[model samples]
Target: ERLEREHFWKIINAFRYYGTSMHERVNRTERQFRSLPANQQKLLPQFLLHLDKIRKCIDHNQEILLTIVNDCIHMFENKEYGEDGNGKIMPASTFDMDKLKSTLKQFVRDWSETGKAERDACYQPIIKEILKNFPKERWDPSKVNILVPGAGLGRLAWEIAMLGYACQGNEWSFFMLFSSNFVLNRCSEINKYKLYPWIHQFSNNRRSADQIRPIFFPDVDPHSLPPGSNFSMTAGDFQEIYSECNTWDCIATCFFIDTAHNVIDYIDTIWKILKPGGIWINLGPLLYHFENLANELSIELSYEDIKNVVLQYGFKVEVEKESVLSTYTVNDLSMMKYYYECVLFVVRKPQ
Candidate 1:
């Protein structure tokens, strides 16, 4: 009878036949596997069983076995680890300024143009909450100025504008502004007047959501004024934007804050940008689980720390909700796991 071929056997053969000396063997095997039809490749099940016998053939096979196992594991990992939608792998430990810039640009461009139905659905509850919690006296659209820092494609910005606030967005990347403008113009095709180009910028693409940064915006002049346009775009450090002491009736932060080198800097900047009695609303990962790493970067913030920061900045904490984010993906023969936890913070600038 043919020796039973186990998966471990192929792994062993990979080591013995290719280890250090036979690099071409592994390549040949891989190429052969790729050539086969998906269903016909099941024959590999028996081949693996035969290779298992070879593994037991030698005394020093233990070391060879380990090497083979590692090679297989790496192959598995490569199949699973994909670009994080913004045409990136996991971001490096330190921020990459140019990558950040390009990512932001693509983010805005995509957000402005397509497939917003699902996202708008997800944010509808927040939209309703804002409307329900604030009355015209408290959240008047005509006189009130609204700001969305790092507004990316301006999803929330568009929502706020639909609610009639004189809204403006602050984006730190040219890509984001481009996307926001693109979506605004596209919608104008239906609505007859252009809107939504004014808000949203980057923090991160929802890499968790099959989301990746894509080019969607056409190049446009940020300086050239559209007719009767109150909207504007500025690119710079967020701190620089706040230095002007900008006042807004409402500020929206979504999926931001986790990437901050200093959460206190983010908090303080937000504090300075709002007028007294204005509202501050945030929805994103709080970095609570990664607190240790955050601390190294001077960004450690406990729930209590958030309270203290808000109070120090003359803002009264109103709502803090810990929420579970359930995300899913296909196994795709890859051995990686996915998880996410985000928190929502809604505060007031103390009327």
Candidate 2:
């Protein structure tokens, strides 16, 4: 029990750190910034050093980060903003990270044992946007086979399933799949199965993406899906899974593409999944993210360059906007505010 408690908090710490500072730090080192010319090298190093200083500040001032996070959660907790410009407060539990961490650990343990929770939080607006933009008069979520690859814990997948969409989640980690399955199993009668092909593909050849071909259709029994719920879960490389070009109706890539070693391949795979007129919703810290890390750590470091590359892939950009910086903290004592941006974009697979 003591070990478990330690493990759980360690995981929580990992998540919190990765969500903020460490994410920037990792991107700075692993993305080939060191190979750049001498002139460019100076910038990446300088930025990385600056970021390191900031990280130290964050470590020293952990309370500040928590305070900001709590404040944001409090501000939005009771409020529900609908399209009509009227917002109403719904009964909600207070947003306390310490409490949340404890609750989440218990939830994960319960889910692992009984498989009774659903994974639909943080996905209300995305679903609403889908219904608003692509009505069933033409595009239907029910009949379409939608895939959520890199579906950590399957929160988005559960939401899509609740909306009567044919949903599938492809995850790589065992722990993730266990939690995801646990959540999905409880919410509705959705067919959930694990596929090991992705691990095989990753092991056989991590470089060439051809191994991702078989995941297009999971071998799981789709008939197990309950009435009114069309859902499946596959575990494998997406490249091998959906080899057929233009087959899906929509794909949601949230915080997934930025981790890709090859961002272009990631975009290309999305292009291949959607049929003509299919939609793709991408939400994450984009190329403009972590500029504090210096130029050495990123490949598509410039926002303009990233936009150009995305456009060249034949995607028509619909929405490109930044958020209000709801939470802010500085690891560096020198700067009051860190200027990082979160970009959200919705592009279409032209009809």
Clashes of each: 21, 16
Ten residues in a row with the worst lDDT in model 1? 193-202
* TM-score (C-alpha) between model 2 and the true structure: 0.49
The total number of steric clashes, by the backbone 3 Å criterion, in model 1 comes to 21
The candidate that achieves the highest lDDT relative to the unseen native structure: 2
Error of 2 at 126 (Å): 2.0
Task: Please report, in order, the local distance difference test score of every candidate based on alpha carbons.
Answer: 0.49, 0.50
